[PDB]
DNA sequence: ATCGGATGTATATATCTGACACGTGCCTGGAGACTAGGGAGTAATCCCCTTGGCGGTTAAAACGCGGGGGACAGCGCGTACGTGCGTTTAAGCGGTGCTAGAGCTGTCTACGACCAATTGAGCGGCCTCGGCACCGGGATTCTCGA
DNA sequence: TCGAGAATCCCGGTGCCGAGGCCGCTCAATTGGTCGTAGACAGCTCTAGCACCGCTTAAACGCACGTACGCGCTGTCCCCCGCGTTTTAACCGCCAAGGGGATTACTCCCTAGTCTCCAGGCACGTGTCAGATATATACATCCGAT
């Protein structure tokens, strides 16, 4: 309820524990879909396929979220800000 | 088209949850959809090539799979 | 880390933190060549 | 239509299961990641052998070629525990 | 007749050779070859089961999930620098909070 | 005292035919031959492994057209396609 | 007996010793004949492109000869040859010049 | 000369650094420092002077770069300063931790 | 042997100099001794590949061009050894 | 803010030296001719499935408010570092002898590819039964304001 | 230091579809020779990494010190969030289809392989000049004076 900061760590834990995926499955399979058109046009996709590339990105985004993580600890602050995305982004080695 | 607004705020929100944060701007949303867009258009650059010089229309699991490799990254448990 | 699995640290890398020598409170003790901070499980 | 037979590494992954753990099951999922698992590592360590045997200028593959692929790419004693595993099993198979 | 049981294994050993011998890696190949890399997948196969039925048993559940799986071989070190970049699908992330992020009072 | 082999001719010709002023020493040799040498082994083994990929018993020269799409950033691979095509078209034209 | 093939195509780089690494390279087991003929296109072209920027570096500092700092300095300052060198080093190198803003007075 | 200000010389050192092309470790030193490293692995070994020379130059390459990311996160800091902990943020975060 | 000195041997002014080349200007006291240390943790993978490399071809003297090599195994290429 | 003075910065003038570019030899690869035989494509196909679409809803999202907790600007401070200089010292060329080792070559013998057929390991179809999901409720533990 | 309310864990209690195991029917893995050969052994050649010392000085050593700033503390104020609400299309489950992905069969033609000769590119001398080296100088900059 109140003390705001206390519900994060609730809810953090809870999901830390469960292992399900975040993102409804059609937005996500009409963005690949979009994305596809921009390259070529009518391509069929097996629904096993867009799957696949759904877990990839999770993956990837969530390691991002994480070094950002310790970067805003290097920083005296809790609260992640932009400038730490750019900072893990390019000292990572992938600009 | 605009489906890039898909990706809505509890979604990234619950992601960011998986990260190990509580406490986040709301003026992180826009370059966070950025990089994953610029994600996942490196990535299908090469799906479509892969699926396109095997002469096939259709797009299947395993060469995203083969992509993904090709990159950096692998996944298991797909083919 | 949950509760259950944690049953492997007892037995296995509870062996070297404590040395036993003489207390000097009173008989003998269990010195310390480690460190160990707080909320740890130990023994 | 016309039906297919595919090779799978999985009867003898699940024999193994039985042989360490007679008493717990395995999911279709499961099978399919270690699956994966063996490829990829059977793919990298051959490939890896088979590169420094061109390197060497031997037009062959001895067993001594995957035992130093063995030693570079496993860490730790780990490497020392499959070396010694192999020259076990090589040893074992050669009088027979 | 066999060719498994001449070393007491139990991954083929015809099959790899086979395999290896179609896979182009070389033109020539001995014999120990094939026996050696089915003695060595056995054991990082072991290795990695062994710790999978312990993850099973932990939350008292016959089937494996590959979430016992990921925990199983994140947690280990050894297999963390060896499966460095590396992925699971379904796999899920290992508990983990931050030391200076828990608050307390009196 | 033997017969060792290396790129010397043929890059200080093709230097001569851009820079016909400029001179060069034996280290600008060894790092060139380096560096053929190492963009030669990559592309050829991407090459490779695409040919297994769809159980191809032959490496033809459209494979490497995928493979230097896929491998080559995009603006210098549309100058590389493009220049290797007008040669093969000349080649075969004239055999 | 004559007219090389790298002369039949009006080449440089030589196409026989390619088709022939090709074929004791032990990438495959059949190759087409375009393949070395493509690779020596596509290896003079790249070869053609990092001599021409080494030229120019060459004709900004003036010097006659060419040293691996002026092929460096080529190499770094463009910015698609940075992206495909993206982890590499260079014998008696050096680093391009700059200062991050706050660091000045 | 007279006591100058910290750091102002500091920056004609760059410019002439950065500019610069050679070795900045010893070369007999660093010899015999990898001749005294590699016994554990295995006694009575030869070197290469051609070799030896080589290792250097990698090993600056990558020390170098160590330092380029490292001041880069230094600015995130706040303060012009280096300290331990950035080197230490710098290698954890590029991924061999 | 195996010896605590010549571990020092990168006195100061050579990681002076060195952070000069990369661009700094205030470093902190403190900092030449974790230098030593990650040095020493890079080299060793490099140095233990390149002995094995050494070994396996029965000769027991190394050259450059397998310490390129297994540079290039390890990720960092080099150019100008062949 | 403005000007003078010490001082490192980049430039022009002899010169000289060892690495750069060029001319020779010929032997090992590559191009010219020919063959056959095994991959490949191209016609045809037909059932799996992926696209498309429709009813119901509720779990999820979207929007507004109240505030307290955390980002952000500043100020002293005292302290750790960069600058500067006199001094010792091991780096850096210099040049010398050689054994230990790498490297090339004749050899000839144990060892891997070809192949024919077998025939049991191994892959696919069908119940099926219990490990596990769904659900309803009581027992169990945490937290913050009086 | 102590309650009220609020959450999670667990004990049933029940129903259902996925891992499993048996039967049937294949296809490629041995076994045994068979045949050619790649590398292993011993010898000889050459060449250079190492042990060794001399002499010279660029640079490391370490003290002195005067201040730039990293840090602790303060105050500030502003906006992220949690709680509540209304609002809605992702999700579920159901329909139907056509098309194209995977499979069969086939003739044909690209190429591995052999033999063939000749020519061009690396080892090897040999002449020669591009830029490092040391000298004198106009110039831009840190510092200090007002």
Redesign the pocket.
Known sequence: ????????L??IR?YQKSTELL????????LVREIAQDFKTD??????AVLALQEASEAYLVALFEDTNLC?IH?????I?PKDIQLARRIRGER | RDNI??I????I??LARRGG???????IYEETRGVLKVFLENVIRDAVTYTEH???????AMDVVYALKRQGRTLYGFG | LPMPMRFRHLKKTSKEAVGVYRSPIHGRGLFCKRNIDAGEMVI | ????????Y???V?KVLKQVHPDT?????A?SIMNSFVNDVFERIAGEASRLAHYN????I?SREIQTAVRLLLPGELAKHAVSEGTKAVTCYTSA | ????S?AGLQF????V??LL?KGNYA??????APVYLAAVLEYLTAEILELAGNA?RDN????I?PRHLQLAVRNDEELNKLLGRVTIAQGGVLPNIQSVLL?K??
């Open positions: 309820r109140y003390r705001p900061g206390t519900v994060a609730r809810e809870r993102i409804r499955k059609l937005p996500f399979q009409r391509l069929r996709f097996q629904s096993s805003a920083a005296k602050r809790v609260t800000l | 607004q898909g809505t705020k509890p979604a929100r619950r944060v509580k406490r986040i701007s709301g003026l095997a002469k096939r229309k259709t797009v299947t | 239509r016309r039906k297919t037979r595919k090779e799978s999985a009867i003898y699940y099951g395995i999911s279709s999922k099978m200028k031997r037009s062959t001895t | 007749k066999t060719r498994s001449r083929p050993v015809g099959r050779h086979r011998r033109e020539r190949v001995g014999a120990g099973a008292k559940k016959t089937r999930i608050p009072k009196t």
